[PDB]
Amino acid sequence: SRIWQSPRFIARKRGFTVKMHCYMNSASGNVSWLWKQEMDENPQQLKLEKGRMEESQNESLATLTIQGIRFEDNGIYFCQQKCNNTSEVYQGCGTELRVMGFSTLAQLKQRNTLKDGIIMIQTLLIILFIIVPIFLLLD
C-alpha cells in the first residue's frame, strides 16, 4: 500500500508477450526487479537478456516487458524500492507467470501413445536383426 503491483496471475500461450506493472512514486530510490522460482527460497537479482526483456519507468509507474515467452520463464517476479530516507526496503506482492500450449487435453494423449508406439516398434526390429542372422549361422 505504498508499492502496488498488478496483476496477481497471468497465463499466456507460447510465443506471445507479457507486461508487468508496479505503482510507486518515483522520487524515492529506484525500483529493481527480482525472480523467485519453484526451487528457490530467497529471490535473486534478475539478469536481463538484451533484445528480449525491457524495463522502463515513468514518473509514477515502473514496467517490465518480456517478449516471446517459453517454458524457462515460469516463476514469480517482484519489484522492490529502496527508500532514500530510512533505508527500509519495501517489496511488492508478486506476479506469477505460467506458459501454456495450444492443444487440448484430449490431443496430448494422442501424441503420447504415438511416440511410445514408435519407440517400441523400432526396439523390436533391432533385437530381431541380431537374433535371427546369428541363429542362421550356428545351425
Next chain:
Amino acid sequence: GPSVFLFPPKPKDTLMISRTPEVTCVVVDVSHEDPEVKFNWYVDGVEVHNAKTKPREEQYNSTYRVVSVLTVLHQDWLNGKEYKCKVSNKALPAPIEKTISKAKGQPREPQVYTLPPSRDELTKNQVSLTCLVKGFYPSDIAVEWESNGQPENNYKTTPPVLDSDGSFFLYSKLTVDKSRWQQGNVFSCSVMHEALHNHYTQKSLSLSPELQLEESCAEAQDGELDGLWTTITIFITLFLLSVCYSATVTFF
C-alpha cells in the same frame, strides 16, 4: 420589532456521552430605547432556572442581538419533551413564545454503501469516492471520512432528500488524488444515527487483486507441432517397409 428564533442541538451532541447538547434562544433587532430582555424557560410546563444570558452586541442598523443558552441532557431530548422560550419586552406589546421538540414517528435504521470511481474518471488528476446512505427516519445523521486513523477533510454532503415512502436518503463525496487511490490506500466512511447499534458504523473502500487468463483451445486445435509429427511418421513407415523388404530377400 425584535425577532425570536429557537434552535435545536447538533445532530452529533445527543448521540455520544462525552459531549454536551444545548438549545438556543436568540432575539435580534432590539431597539436602543428598550434593551431590556426578559427570558423564561419552560420544560413541559415546569419552568427551570439554570439557563445563561450572553451580553448584547451592536449591529449595523442600530439593532442588538441577545443569545440565551440552555444545556439539556442526552436522554431527555431523545424522547420528545418540549422546550419553550418566553421573551418579554417593554417595546413589544405581548410576550413571545417559541417551542421545539423532536420529530414524531417510528425510527428506521440507515443502509450504507461505498462506491468506487468510474472508469472514465481515471484519465483526470483527481477522483471522487461516493457513500450512499438510505432508508432512515428522522433526518438527523452524521457522516465523516478518514484514512489510517487520521481524518480527511475534502468532502461534502447533500441535504436529506425525501423519498417515495416517507424516508430519506443522502450521498457524500470525497476528492482524492489519482496517486493515492492507484497505489492501494484504504478509505473509511463512518455514520452516526440514533437507530443504529451503539450509534455507529463504518465501511471501507480500496482496490482489489486481478487475473489475466487466455481464451480457449476447444474449437481450433494446434498445427505448428502436429504438422511435424504427421510429416515424420510417414518416412518412418516408408523406411521400415524398405529395410524389412531388404531383409526379406536374404531369407530367400
Next chain:
Amino acid sequence: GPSVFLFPPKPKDTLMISRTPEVTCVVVDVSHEDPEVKFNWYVDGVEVHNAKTKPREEQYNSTYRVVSVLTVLHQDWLNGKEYKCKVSNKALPAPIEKTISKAKGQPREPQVYTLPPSRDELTKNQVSLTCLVKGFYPSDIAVEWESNGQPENNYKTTPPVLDSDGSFFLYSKLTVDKSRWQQGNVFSCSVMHEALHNHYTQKSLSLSPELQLEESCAEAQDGELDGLWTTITIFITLFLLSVCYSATVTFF
C-alpha cells in the same frame, strides 16, 4: 397589504427551440375593497405591451390572488436582460418594482459518470442506479432517465450543492426491479445545460454477464520441440540410402 413576487422561467423552456419561456409576476393578498390592480412591465426601461393577465378569484384567508405572465425570446434570457415588474394599487402608497435576470459569470460544462449498483444490494427486490453530474456553472440544469426509447418515472434528484472551487454537483437516483437489471437491459441518463454542445448529452448503463473459467488448454512441457527440424533430414537420407541398398541387392 398585498405581496409581490417574481419568478424566472423553467430551465428546459429556455434551451430548446420548440417550447416557450415566460417570466411571471404574482400579486397576492388583495383586500375586499380595491379590485383595481395595474401592472407595468419593463424590459431594459422600455415598457412592453405583449403581456397577459388571468382574472382573479377569492382565496382562503379572505384575500385575492392575481397572476401576470410575460413571454420572452430565447436569446434575450441567455444574454442577461433585466426584467422589471411594476405594481400599482390604490391602498398602497408606492409602486412595487422587482427585477430578475440570469446569474452572471463565465460558464463551465459538466461531466457525467454513471455508477452500477453496490453488490450487497443484490439481496433485495429493487436496485438503485446512480448518475453523478459535476463541475457546472450556472446552477440551471435538467436531468432525465430513459430505457428502450420510453421514459422512466421512478427517479429522485438532489438540489445543487456548492463545490470547493465555485462550481456545483448533483446526484440522481433511479430505482428499478432486480429482474430488469439482471437480464441485460440498457438505461440512459440524459442531461441539458447551456454550455454543452447543442445543449444535450447522454450516458448509458448495462450489465454484460458473467464468465466461465474454463481450464481446458494443456500446460507446456520442457522438451516438446527440440531438434524436430533436424530429424526430418535424417529420415530423408536414411530412406534414400535404404532404397539404394535395396536396389543394389535386388539387382543380383
Next chain:
Amino acid sequence: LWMHKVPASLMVSLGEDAHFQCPHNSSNNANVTWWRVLHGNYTWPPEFLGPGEDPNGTLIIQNVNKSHGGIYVCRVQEGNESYQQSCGTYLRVRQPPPRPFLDMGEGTKNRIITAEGIILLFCAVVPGTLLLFRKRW
C-alpha cells in the same frame, strides 16, 4: 512482512479439499476473517465467508466443485485499529493431473527415436553382407 509469505495458486481436483492459512505475527488477541474475490467487472465489495477454525485461523473447503474458483483473502484486525490483509491465492480446479504415460523424459524421446533409426539401418545392412561371405566361403 507476512503478507508475502502466502502462495499464489493452488491446484485441486474435483472431489478433494482445500486448505488456506493465515500466518500472522500478532500477540494472540487479533481477529481474523476470510473474504472472497470474484472475476469480471462491476464487482465491489468482496464476499464474506467466515472466521477461522483452530487457534491458527485456517479455512477448509470440502468437496470442491467448479463453482469455487476465485481469489481468497484474509484480514487481521486487532481491536479498533486499521486492518492488515494478505495478497491472495487463486484456487484453480483442474480435474486431471498431467496424464501419465508409459515412460520417462520428454525431450529424451526425440533423440532415442532418431539415435535409434540409424542403428536400425547400420545394424540391418552388414548382416546382409556377412550372410553371403559365410555361405559362399
